[PDB]
From a paper:
Decreasing the incubation time and increasing the ATP concentration allowed us to circumvent this outcome. Thus, to capture long filaments in cryo conditions, we froze TgAct1 samples after a 10 to 20-min incubation period with 1 mM ATP. We determined the structure of unstabilized TgAct1 filaments at 2.5 Å resolution, which revealed an overall architecture similar to skeletal and other actin filament structures. A single TgAct1 protomer is in nearly the same conformation as skeletal actin, with Cα RMSD values of 0.5 and 0.8 for chicken and rabbit actin, respectively. The most striking difference is in the position of the d-loop (residues 40–51 in TgAct1 and residues 39–50 in skeletal muscle actin), which forms important longitudinal contacts between actin protomers. Two of these substitutions, amino acids Pro42 and Ile44, point in the opposite direction relative to the comparable residues in skeletal actin (Gln41 and Val43). While Val43 of skeletal actin sits within a hydrophobic portion of the binding pocket, the comparable residue in TgAct1 (Ile44) is displaced by 5 Å and does not make inter-protomer contacts. These changes in the D-loop conformation break most of the backbone interactions that occur among skeletal actin d-loop residues 41–44 (TgAct1 42–44), and hydrogen bond contacts between side chains are lost due to a combination of residue substitution and mainchain displacement (TgAct1 amino acids 39–41 and 46). The d-loop position and resulting decrease in longitudinal protomer contacts likely contribute to the decreased filament stability of TgAct1, explaining the rapid depolymerization rate constant and high critical concentration. The C-terminal phenylalanine of TgAct1 occupies a different position than skeletal actin and in TgAct1 it does not interact with the d-loop as it does in skeletal actin. TgAct1 filaments do not contain an extensive water network within the center of the filament.
The cytoskeletal protein actin plays a critical role in the pathogenicity of the intracellular parasite, Toxoplasma gondii, mediating invasion and egress, cargo transport, and organelle inheritance. T. gondii expresses a single divergent actin gene (TgAct1) that is essential for the successful completion of this lytic cycle. Unlike skeletal muscle actin, Toxoplasma filaments intrinsically undergo rapid treadmilling due to a high critical concentration, fast monomer dissociation, and rapid nucleotide exchange. Cryo-EM structures of jasplakinolide-stabilized and native (i.e. unstabilized) filaments show an architecture like skeletal actin, with differences in assembly contacts in the D-loop that explain the dynamic nature of the filament, likely a conserved feature of Apicomplexan actin.
Author numbering:
A (entry chain B), B (entry chain C), C (entry chain A): 6 to 376
Write the structure that this text describes.
Amino acid sequence: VQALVVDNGSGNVKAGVAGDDAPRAVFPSIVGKPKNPGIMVGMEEKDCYVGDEAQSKRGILTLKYPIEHGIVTNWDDMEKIWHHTFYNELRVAPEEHPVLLTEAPLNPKANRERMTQIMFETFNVPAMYVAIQAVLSLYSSGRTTGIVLDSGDGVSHTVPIYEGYALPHAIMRLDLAGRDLTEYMMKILHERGYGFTTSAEKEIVRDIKEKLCYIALDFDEEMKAAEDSSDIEKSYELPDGNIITVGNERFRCPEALFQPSFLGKEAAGVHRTTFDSIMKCDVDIRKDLYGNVVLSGGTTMYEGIGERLTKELTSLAPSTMKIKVVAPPERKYSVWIGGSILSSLSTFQQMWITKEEYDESGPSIVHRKCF
Amino acid sequence: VQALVVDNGSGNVKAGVAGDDAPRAVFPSIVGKPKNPGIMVGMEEKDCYVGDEAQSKRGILTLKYPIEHGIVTNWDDMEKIWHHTFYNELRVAPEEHPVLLTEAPLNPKANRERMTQIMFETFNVPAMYVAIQAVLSLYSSGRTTGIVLDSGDGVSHTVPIYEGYALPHAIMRLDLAGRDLTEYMMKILHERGYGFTTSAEKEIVRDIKEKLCYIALDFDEEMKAAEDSSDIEKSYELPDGNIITVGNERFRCPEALFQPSFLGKEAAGVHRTTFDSIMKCDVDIRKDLYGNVVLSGGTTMYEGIGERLTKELTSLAPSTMKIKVVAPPERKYSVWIGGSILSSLSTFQQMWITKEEYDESGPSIVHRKCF
Amino acid sequence: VQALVVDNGSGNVKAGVAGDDAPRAVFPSIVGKPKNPGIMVGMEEKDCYVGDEAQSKRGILTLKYPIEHGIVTNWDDMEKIWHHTFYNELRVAPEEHPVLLTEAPLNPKANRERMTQIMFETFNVPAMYVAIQAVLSLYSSGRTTGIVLDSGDGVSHTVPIYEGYALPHAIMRLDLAGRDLTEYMMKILHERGYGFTTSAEKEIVRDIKEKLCYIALDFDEEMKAAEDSSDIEKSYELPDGNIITVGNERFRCPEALFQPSFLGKEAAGVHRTTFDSIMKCDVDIRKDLYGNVVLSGGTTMYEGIGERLTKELTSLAPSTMKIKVVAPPERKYSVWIGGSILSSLSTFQQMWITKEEYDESGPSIVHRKCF
Ligand SMILES: Nc1ncnc2c1ncn2[C@@H]1O[C@H](COP(=O)(O)OP(=O)(O)O)[C@@H](O)[C@H]1O
Ligand SMILES: Nc1ncnc2c1ncn2[C@@H]1O[C@H](COP(=O)(O)OP(=O)(O)O)[C@@H](O)[C@H]1O
Ligand SMILES: Nc1ncnc2c1ncn2[C@@H]1O[C@H](COP(=O)(O)OP(=O)(O)O)[C@@H](O)[C@H]1O
Ligand SMILES: [Mg+2]
Ligand SMILES: [Mg+2]
Ligand SMILES: [Mg+2]
C-alpha cells in the first residue's frame, strides 16, 4: 500500500502517490463563488468552484484563498479543497491510504491540530504525518548537510541541517513571498495607467509577473541603464486583446525580496535571513552550510536569482569561504519529491500516527509524534 | 606473544604492540553526545562518538573527558574508550595479549583497583601490569640515573632515580598541566574580544595554543618589548574563516607553568618543583640528578622551555654544579616507548599479574605486585 | 563638589549625583531613526531620537541599542546617548563634575579605553573612574563578604568577595540575560498565533514579559498542572486594543535562566554558575559565601526567583551548609546606590584618574588605575 503525498501550499496544491517521480495533480488552491447567484433555467448551478474550474470562469466569480502565510484561515474552504483533491483529482479513497502532509516551520499549534482532526474524523484515513517543507526539500537533493531557502506563495524560511541533525534554534522565518510580490506589482503598475483591482485581475497580474520579471545583478546600475534606453521594455497581451508595456518594473518587482523596505516592511532580505541563520550555528558547521545553500519553491524561479544570492553571500561572508548555491531545475516540486522519498522508506513506516493512537490521545498526539 | 602497551593520558590515548618503535594509535580521549538526539530518517544514529570521529563532528556534539588530573571520573566512558581502543584502533582480541597500563604517581588506590578489575573481568586479559609514567620515560632514554619532569594534560610530576634505585620520598606532584593552560588561554583571549565557551571552541583554543605559544627567556623584558612593537603579533584562521590576532598572550599563556599565581594557585612552578625534588635526596645523588634532568610529555614541547628551565635551575643551584636538560625530539611518546621496552624484556615476564593470582586475591593484588 | 554616577547598562541608563538615595534619571538606552525621512512643512525634523522620546514615537522609528552583552557596538550612538544624559536629563556641565562609570567583568580592554578617551576628550571631565558593577552592588548592601549574582539586560556574572578581598580567579560570566529572554518569549509566542517582528513589537513583548512572567518552583510539576487546568492563563491588552492570552509561557520564558538549553546554548544555568564560582574559592570561604548570596539587577526581579535559587543551591551544596539568598526590594538600582556610596567616600578621592595623568599617559592609564 502506497501513501498519498499532499503539499498544501498557500498558492497551489501538489498531490500524488508515493514513489512517483512527479506530482500528478497541480491545481490552484482557490474557491470561487458567483457574484450574481442566478443561472439560465436548465443549467446546473454550483454553489462554489474549486481549482482549475474556478480559474477557468473567474470572470463571474469572486476568488478566495483559504491559506495566507502558511496558516489556514477558512476551514470550510480548506475542507472543500481537500475533498476536491481526493475525489476529483487523485480519484482515490482516502480511507485506504496513509497521507503525508506538509507545513511551514514556526506555525501555530492549532493549525496542526485541526489538520490531524480533519484528516482522522472527516476523511477517515488509517494514518498520517506532518513534515516540515524544507526538510523534505533536503531529502529531495540527496544530501545530509546544507541550508535550505524555501520561498513559495505564503512565507519564506531557512532551515539548516548538518550531518542529518537538526538545528532548531537557527530556523528563521520571513513573511514575504510571491503574493506580496504580486500585490507590489499591482501597486506599481498604476504608474503607467494600468488598473487591476479584482481577483481575476490579480490572477492576470500574477501571470504577468511570472512571465516578465527577473532579478538584476546590480540594482542601481540596472535602474540607470533602464532610464537611458528602451530595449528593456516588453509587451504583454491581456485576455481582451489590449496590450500593456512594462519597463523597469520587471526587475523592480522582485527586488523587494532583497529590499523589503519597498513594501514598507522593517525586515531583512532573503540573503540577510540566510546569513543570519548560518551565523546562529556552531563555528564548525558554517563552512559546509556555505557550501550547500539550496533553493526551493516557486519564488526562487526568477532568472538571475542564484547569481544575486551568491554575490550577496560573498559580500557578507569571509573571503576564504566558498559559497555555492544550488538551483535544481525542478525546484518548484522539491518538497513533493522529498515527501514521496521519505514516505517510501522502510524505516519511516513506524513514524505514522495511526488511528488507534489518535483515538487514545486526541488531536494533541501530533505534537509528540511529529517534530 | 607480544604485549599491548596502552598509555591512558588525560588528553590522548597512545596504544600499540610491544616491540614497535612508535605507537600506532594516537587519538583524543573524548566521548561526544549529540545535543539534539534526532537524525534524518534512513541515517544511522549513534548514542555516542569516541575519538577522532567525535572530534570530526564536534559541532553538534557535547564533548566530555573521562579523565581529569590523571584520575578517571566516569567509568562507563572510560570503558567505552578502552573498547574503542581495542576493537576499532588496534583491531585485536584483548583476551590473547597481556596489557601494560600506565598511571601517575600518588594517585588514589581505587583507580588502580578499578583498572585491574575492568581489565580482568570485562576484557578477559591473560595478564596485566601498571607502571609509573616517569619510570617508563627513564627507560626510554637508556639511562639509569636522572630526574624526569613529566607534563601532559592532567598533572605534572617529578621522579628521581639513582643507579636504578627509586627514591619514593622525593616524588613531587603539581596539579598544573596543559588543560589548565588551555583554560587560561581561553580566559585571557577575552581581553581582545574573542569569546570561546563551548567544548568545540575549547578544542579550537587548544589548537591555537599548540600552534602559537612559546616560553620567554626573561618574562619582564619580553613583556616590555611586546609593549613597544608589533612584530610579535601573529594571526590564526578559525574554521569559519574569521581571523584572530594574538600579541603577548603567546608567551603569557605558558608562563603559568613557572608562575602558578597567574591561575590563582598557591604553588611553586615546575623549576621549583624539580629543585625541591632534587633537594629531598641524599647529598651524594644531587650532582648526577642535576646532570640528567629529562623532559617528557606534551606540555614540555614549547619552544624555549629547555633554556628557561636551565636558567632557573642554574639560579637555584650552586655555581659549581653543571645543569644539563635533555629534550628528546620524540618526548611526546617517551612513556609509550619505555613501556614497550619494559614489556619486551625477558626478566619482566615474571612480573605480570596473571588471571590465576587475580582469581585468588581479588583486585587488591595490584597493590602488592605493582609498586 | 559632588561626583556624577552613571550606570551604562545594556538596557537602561541610570544617572544621578553622588549622595542621593536613588538615581534621578532612568531612561531606555535606545536611539531611533525615522523610517520615512519626511515631515510636514513647518514641523521640526530631528535626525534621531534618544530615550523616552524615542520610546514614545516608536511607531515610525527604527530602534537600535548601542550596547549588546555589555559591549558598546556603536560609538556614535553611545556618544549621542551620553550627550543626552548630561545635557537633557541631568542638566549639568560635565566639565565641572568627576564621573563614575560602570562596566561588566571580563570585558575587552578597548571598551574601557574608548570610554576613558571619550570622557576626557569629548566631554572634558576633570576626573573619572571605572568600577565593576557587582562590587558596587556589594557596596550597596553594607557587607564585606558575599557572592553577588548580577543579571540585567546584557550579561550575567558572579563576583565573590571575602572580608573585603577580591578573588579574581573565581569570577564567572554567563551570556544570558533579559534580552535573550525577550527574544525567546517572541519565539514561543508564535505557538499561539501572535506575531511580533519589529522593534516596537520587541518593546511590547518585553513589557508583556515584565508584567506576566514568574519562576516556577518545580518546572515539570508546574507544566503538568498547566496542562490540566486554565487558571494560569492571563490576558494582556495591546496598544491597538487587541487582547492576547498566555498560558504556560509565563513560567516557560524565565526557565531559560536555569535551563539554557531552551535557547540552544551549551551552558550552565545561574544556579550552577553561582555554585561553580563558590567552588573555585578556598575551602575556608565557602561557608560565608553560601551565607551571603546577593541578587542584583532587573532580571532577578521575577517572582519566586529566590526560592528556586535556594532550592537549587541546597541541592548542590552539602546538607550541613546554610544557604541564604538576599533579594533587596530596590535591587534594580543597587549598582547605582553602591557607586554613589563609593564615590562619596573620603578615602576614594585619591583613586580618581585626573586629567593630568591622562594627558601624561594616554587612554592606557585606565588599565593601571582601575582594577
Ligand atoms: N517561473 C516563475 N517565475 C516567478 N515566479 C513564479 C514562477 N512560477 C511560479 N511563481 C510564483 O510562485 C508562487 C507560488 O509557487 P509555489 O511554490 O507553488 O507556492 P506554494 O508552495 O505556496 O503553493 C506564485 O505566487 C507564483 O507567482
Ligand atoms: N607542540 C605543542 N606545543 C605545546 N603544547 C602541546 C604541543 N603538543 C601537545 N601539546 C599539549 O599537550 C597536552 C597533552 O599532551 P599529552 O602528553 O599527550 O597528554 P596526556 O599524556 O595527558 O594525554 C595537550 O593539552 C596539548 O595542548
Ligand atoms: N519586574 C520585572 N520582572 C522581570 N523582568 C524585568 C522587570 N523589570 C525589568 N526587567 C528586565 O530587566 C532587564 C534590564 O534591567 P536592568 O538591570 O536595568 O538592565 P541594564 O542594567 O543592563 O540596563 C530588561 O530586559 C527588563 O525586561
Ligand atoms: Mg510550497
Ligand atoms: Mg602522558
Ligand atoms: Mg545593570
